[PDB]
Symmetry: C3
Subunit: 117 residues, 3 copies
């Protein structure tokens, strides 16, 4: 068995609470889907946002997922890089899994499809 | 075996090195007491502070804990949420444990008690 | 196998893309050699930069390492601390290992040598 990080990234059109939660929830749902993730198997989660989003912590979205109320999560500010993608929310979900590193399904949504390898 | 994130959050009254260290220490000691954490079982730890705190890295508190000198720890800036908790320091301690997810003991002290789920 | 964090830190003289990438690559290479790290045993990586660095995400360096293209990595902003080390990049690499906690090899390069315990 092993522990692996799963990466995701999305963008919002405006810095509002609803937009941020909607797009965050959608990101987590797509990750969970592609990686068949169960909440008991999640060690922890880190969420970041670029410094142009202030309306809400994206972690608020985690509590909208049935069964995820005990998954530990905290947020952080993403680096402000010159030319870097605007209004972008990123996740690092750490899970216990037997899926090989090269088979993990990292998720890029909305404008963040540009950051896809 | 399994690893598990443990969250803690607290607040300081003022941005002084002595308040940041004292409050940070007290948060960790509570987390440790509640979870029976031994330092050798601690994978790593993350500390965040809101952007209104600049006096000291809270990670410095972690060496006021004897036996904790080899625990890897690093800091990061929390995102600046409009109306979010001020002067708040947050921990994500990643430990090895067989305590089930719904039984991990997350610690919310001072004004941060309102962050309790 | 147990999981463990490996801390690194380095600095750049100038906030340019090439120096950030050079110094970041050099930091990771040293961590890799001191700890005999194979990419598939790397759970995930976090890199932080101080807010004087905007030229590039340090994470891009990781992509210069053959065998490392599936290692999940993301960045964040380090807190701005009065008297804190300028132009500094920090890493937390989380890895599967049987090496004991007090035997793990954390790496401090360039002006970050001052961060060594």
């Amino acid at each position: 068995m092993m522990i692996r990080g799963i990466r995701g990234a999305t963008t919002v059109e405006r810095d509002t609470e609803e937009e941020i939660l909607q797009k965050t929830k959608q990101l987590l749902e797509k990750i969970i889907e592609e990686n068949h993730t169960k909440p008991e198997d999640v060690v922890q989660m880190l969420l970041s946002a670029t410094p142009d989003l202030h309306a809400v912590f994206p972690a608020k979205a985690v509590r909208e997922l049935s069964g995820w109320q005990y998954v530990p999560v905290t947020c952080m500010q993403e680096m402000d890089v010159t030319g870097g993608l605007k209004k972008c929310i990123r996740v690092m979900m750490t899970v216990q899994t037997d899926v090989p590193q090269d088979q993990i399904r990292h998720v890029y949504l909305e404008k963040a499809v540009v950051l896809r390898p």
